[PDB]
């Protein structure tokens, strides 16, 4: 079952990669409502 | 509304829970209908003065009885014949059916004791309760079916858990003498006793509960206290304070 | 066909932080009446620890 | 103990539902806070229906019927609509309770715990029906007090 | 719990001989019936005492 | 003789009655093992009726509703919805069942229709330990070994878990302090009735 | 204080953790959601209450639902609707019921509740909402017209 | 004759030995007047009524 969990971690990572590269302008409008506008760096 | 003339002095009476039928116990058990002035069914085993008769609230065609030969007789309305008889060491004053278990009943016996029986296996009682010091007169179950209250010829009344052999709490008063009849009220919160100085008193099922509507914090605090007590019930100092009753 | 069937797992280490039961002992019990109580005790401990493990996100 | 209470007011008729109450010890120092305190009252009692009076003349017609103890058509319309049809309905007047049970199949009770509930409703009435009516509750009683009194004595304005 | 243990609530009087029987009313919590040795039966209102 | 006939009647009666009572054993065992019991046992309908239940109760008194109903009943058209409005739980009953199936088939058709245009619109080394015992502290520890525990280590396992809200989360705390018996303050508690019939 | 708030946040935890399991939302996004949810929760549990706070809570939950709906289609993950979507819908329904209980006189809040029930809720919930509206606001024929129209 | 609640209680506390006096106290010809006094002591009750 270790490989099954190891298979899961890359599925999240591949899915997470796809949502940051391309974002419509509407989503950026929504994320400021849901997540706010904070910068930590 | 109606009167019925009889030949013997009847001692007890109870009514059917659902079918408009009442049975009385005198010298021999009779079953009567409200629209029928003569007993439709007459039940007898021996020649005795039957003290009390009780209908069973579940499977309402059964009956319970106590007679003068220190025996308990179980009847059957539908098949019109008695079922079984058990003889104890002393006379049982009253019999009470458990309102949540169809096959359990408790009998108040004069040997300072309370007996809980399972009517399928009547050879030995389920449990014995022994904290009284005089004759027990009447018993009555709380509607939750987990506790009952017993009155004694001694001027006190006790509450027992059905699975334990000891009394949970004892109520007493200098003005109160020879409690004869006791009924637990229908919402499982109050106990009333009928005594022979011509007073009826009202007691609380729990001596520390707050009766009014509660807030969320109060309800959370109340449940927290109860769980704490049963977690530490076996420690010596907790036992000493909790079980100390003044008599 | 859903790629991940099970519910969200919790790390074992954070759960072990909220544990107060000595798993080391190998006490023997041959009575069912004792067995039922002991299984409930583990059930109560296991449930309470898991909730605290999820609560680490609140920090 | 779930039961329904009918409360009659100058502004209109109200129907309320009771969830739970400690009946035996209600008239006691600690438990009396159940009805007195507004927050605790809201816990056990809700407003399920409210039918206000359209005009002052209509309010006078209902006032006459309630005093006589007959069931007006306005009252019957509210009762038939939002009451399921084994129903306990509380009334302050024994005579109106008998008339309702003749007109409709509901069981009516006039005393006991219901008497204490109605005082709780009366004391907290302005909070329950606040904003549901244009004319205020306090002015509703003042206006009706005159028109009811003029009718009895045959007052002539000239 | 020992501080707040107050079980007694009230006592009803009016019978002239010892109480022997009690019967609670199925539909209403606040109504009970009692029977004394002299032969009288009294109906009690628990809320009003 | 009369005597041995009677005892046979007791034997046959008891066996029939005992067989009847045996059906209550599963209910009793479950209830004695339950974590929480709610009284009264009878369930209660939810607070808000969803309109369709309500509209069945209404009848006709005004002249409009009389004429509408009369024309409807002389025809085949029904007053209320069969599927939406529930009723109290021979050949005519089968027909109403058939009417329900056609009514159910209709709602499928309009929904099947609607989907089309929607698709269309999408297209320790040194430590000493004091061996003396603390007699004061030992006065607080538990003396006896309570039933049903045989070995003292078995009893030790149950006591370890703390229950306060300080050490546990709020929902974990509520599960640990669930009361055994819950009773509504004003409702009459009745005896069990054939598992709610 | 924060006893009830903490209960609600721990109730809100499992669907957030599942969303983390999906890969839809990153861990920092989960932290930000928890922070703003706690901030909005503190507003509606005070002893002094305002309608603006209930409206802001409902609007935040609606915006979060729309964001999740948009992201699911891009990812292509359609499983576990019940764990997240329905949980949020029940929380919003509870908020609406409490708000409508506090302010019975406001028809506009009732219509907002009806619109949300049409968009996201089961038809039986909308039936109950219309019944509750017609119980206390029977004097407005327009409400009867809308109820019949639906 | 008038019997207060304070006096009636003192008879009841005496026990079964004085049961005859208690039964004579409950006589329908008598007047039973109540008192809401925190206690049982009756001398203070009567003088206050006087
Ligand atoms: Mg003196
Ligand atoms: Zn006095």
């Amino acid at each position: 079952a270790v490989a099954a969990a190891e298979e899961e971690r890359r599925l999240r990572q591949r899915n997470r990669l796809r949502l940051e590269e391309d974002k419509p302008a509407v989503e950026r409008c929504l994320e400021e409502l849901v997540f706010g506008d904070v910068e930590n760096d | 509304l109606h009167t019925i003339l009889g030949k013997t002095v009847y001692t007890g009476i109870d009514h059917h829970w659902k079918e408009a039928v009442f049975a009385t116990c005198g010298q021999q058990v009779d079953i009567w209908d409200e629209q029928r002035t003569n007993p439709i069914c007459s039940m007898t085993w021996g020649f005795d003065s039957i003290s009390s008769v009780k209908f069973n609230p579940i499977e309402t065609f059964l009956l319970g009885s106590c007679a003068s030969d220190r025996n308990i007789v179980l009847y059957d309305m539908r098949q019109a014949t008695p079922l079984k008889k058990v003889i104890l060491d002393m006379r049982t004053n009253t019999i009470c059916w458990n309102p949540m278990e169809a096959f359990i009943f408790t009998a108040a016996n004069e040997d300072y004791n309370l007996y809980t029986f399972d009517m399928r296996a009547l050879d030995t009682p389920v449990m014995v309760h022994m904290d009284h010091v005089s004759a027990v007169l009447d018993v009555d179950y709380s509607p939750t079916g987990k506790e009952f209250v017993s009155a004694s010829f001694d001027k006190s009344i006790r509450i027992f858990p059905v699975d334990k052999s000891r009394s949970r709490e004892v109520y007493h008063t200098k003005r109160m003498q020879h409690v004869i009849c006791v009924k637990w009220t229908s919402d499982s919160k109050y106990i009333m006793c009928g005594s022979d100085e011509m007073n009826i008193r009202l007691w609380k099922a729990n001596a520390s509960e707050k009766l009014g509507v509660l807030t969320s914090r109060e309800k959370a605090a109340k449940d927290y206290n109860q769980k704490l007590k049963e977690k530490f019930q076996h420690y010596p100092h907790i036992k000493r304070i909790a079980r100390h009753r003044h008599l | 066909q859903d790629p991940f069937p099970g519910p969200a797992p919790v790390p074992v280490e954070v759960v072990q932080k909220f544990c107060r039961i000595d798993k080391s002992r190998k006490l023997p019990h041959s009575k069912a009446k004792t067995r039922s109580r002991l299984e409930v005790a583990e059930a109560e401990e296991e449930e309470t620890s898991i909730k605290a493990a999820r609560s680490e996100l609140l920090l | 103990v779930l039961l329904h209470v009918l409360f009659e007011h100058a502004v209109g008729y109200a129907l309320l539902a009771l969830k739970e109450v400690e009946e035996i010890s209600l008239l006691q120092p600690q438990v009396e806070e159940s009805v007195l305190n507004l927050g605790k009252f809201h816990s056990i009692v809700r407003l399920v229906a409210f039918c206000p009076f359209a005009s002052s003349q209509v309010a006078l017609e209902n006032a006459n019927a309630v005093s006589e103890g007959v069931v007006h058509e306005d009252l019957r319309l509210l009762l038939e609509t939002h009451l399921p049809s084994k129903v306990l309905l509380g009334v302050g007047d024994p005579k109106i309770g008998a008339a309702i049970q003749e007109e409709l199949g509901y069981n009516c009770q006039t005393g006991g715990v219901i008497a204490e509930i109605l005082r709780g409703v009366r004391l907290h009435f302005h909070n329950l029906v606040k904003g549901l009516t244009d004319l205020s509750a306090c002015k509703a009683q003042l206006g009706l007090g005159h028109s009811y009194s003029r009718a009895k004595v045959k007052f002539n304005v000239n | 719990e020992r501080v707040f243990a107050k079980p007694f609530l009230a006592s009803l009087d009016g019978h002239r001989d010892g109480v022997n029987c009690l019967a609670k009313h199925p539909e209403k919590l606040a109504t009970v019936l009692s029977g004394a040795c002299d032969g009288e039966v009294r109906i009690w209102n628990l809320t009003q005492r | 003789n009369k005597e041995e006939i009677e005892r046979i009647h007791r034997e046959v009666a008891f066996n029939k009655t005992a067989q009847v009572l045996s059906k209550w054993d599963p209910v009793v065992l479950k209830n004695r093992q339950a974590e929480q019991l709610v009284f009264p046992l009878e369930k209660e309908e939810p607070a808000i009726a969803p309109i369709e239940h309500v509209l069945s109760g209404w009848k006709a008194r005004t002249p409009l509703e009389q004429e509408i109903f009369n024309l409807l009943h002389k025809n085949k058209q029904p007053v209320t919805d069969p599927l939406l409005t529930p009723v109290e739980k021979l050949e005519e009953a089968k027909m109403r069942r058939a009417e329900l199936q056609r009514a159910r088939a209709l709602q499928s058709y309009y929904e099947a229709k609607a989907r089309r245009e929607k698709k269309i619109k999408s297209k320790l080394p040194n430590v000493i330990i004091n061996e003396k015992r603390n007699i004061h502290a030992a006065a607080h520890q538990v003396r006896v070994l309570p039933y049903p525990f045989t070995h003292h280590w078995q009893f030790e396992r149950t006591i370890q878990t703390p229950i306060g809200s300080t050490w546990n989360t709020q929902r974990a705390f509520q599960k640990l302090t669930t009361p055994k018996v819950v009773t509504k303050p004003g409702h009459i508690i009745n005896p069990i009735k054939a598992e709610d019939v | 204080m924060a006893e009830i708030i903490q209960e609600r946040i721990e109730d809100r935890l499992p669907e957030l953790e599942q969303l983390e399991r999906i890969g839809l939302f990153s861990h920092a996004e989960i932290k930000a959601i928890i922070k703003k949810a706690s901030d909005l929760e503190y507003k509606i549990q005070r002893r002094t209450l305002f309608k603006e706070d209930f409206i802001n809570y409902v609007q935040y939950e609606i915006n979060l639902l729309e964001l999740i709906q948009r992201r699911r289609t891009r990812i292509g993950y359609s499983f576990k609707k019940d764990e997240i979507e329905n949980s949020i819908v029940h929380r919003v329904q509870g908020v609406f019921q409490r708000a409508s209980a506090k302010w019975k006189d406001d028809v506009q809040l009732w219509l907002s509740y009806v619109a949300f029930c049409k968009k996201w809720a089961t038809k039986t919930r909308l039936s109950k909402v219309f019944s509750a509206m017609l119980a206390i606001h029977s004097n407005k024929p327009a409400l009867w017209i809308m109820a019949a129209k639906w | 004759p008038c019997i207060t609640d304070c006096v009636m209680a003192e008879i009841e506390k005496l026990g079964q030995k004085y049961r005859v006096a208690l039964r004579i106290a409950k006589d329908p010809r008598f007047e039973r007047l109540p008192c809401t006094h925190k206690g049982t002591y009756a001398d203070d009750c009567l003088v206050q009524r006087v």
Side-chain angles (χ1 to χ4, degrees), chain H residues 4-6 35-37 41 45 49:
Chain H
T4 68
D5 288 350
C6 295
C35 70
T36 55
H37 182 216
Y41 182 76
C45 186
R49 303 201 95 92

Side-chain angles (χ1 to χ4, degrees), chain F residues 94-114:
Chain F
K94 291 175 181 178
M95 295 298 102
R96 292 188 296 272
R97 290 182 181 178
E99 289 175 350
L100 187 150
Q101 300 301 58
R102 270 89 62 82
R104 228 170 183 179
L106 289 172
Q107 184 178 2
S108 81
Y109 174 110
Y110 300 88
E111 179 146 71
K113 183 178 178 181

Side-chain angles (χ1 to χ4, degrees), chain D residues 9-11 53 55-61 63 135-151:
Chain D
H9 197 269
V11 66
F53 296 140
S55 78
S56 161
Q57 178 197 48
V58 175
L60 181 61
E61 293 171 35
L135 61 84
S136 177
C138 65
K139 314 308 203 53
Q141 284 158 212
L142 176 60
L144 185 62
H146 294 88
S147 84
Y148 182 91
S149 297
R150 271 83 179 276

Side-chain angles (χ1 to χ4, degrees), chain C residues 13 17 24 26 45 49 56:
Chain C
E13 294 294 328
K17 185 177 180 180
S24 59
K26 182 174 72 68
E45 175 260 352
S49 55
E56 291 294 353

Side-chain angles (χ1 to χ4, degrees), chain G residues 42-59:
Chain G
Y42 266 99
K43 311 286 288 172
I44 65 170
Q45 303 290 338
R46 299 173 325 183
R47 321 198 66 175
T48 311
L49 287 179
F50 298 102
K51 190 183 291 182
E52 293 83 3
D53 283 27
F54 285 85
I55 290 146
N56 293 339
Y57 193 102
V58 158
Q59 183 59 78

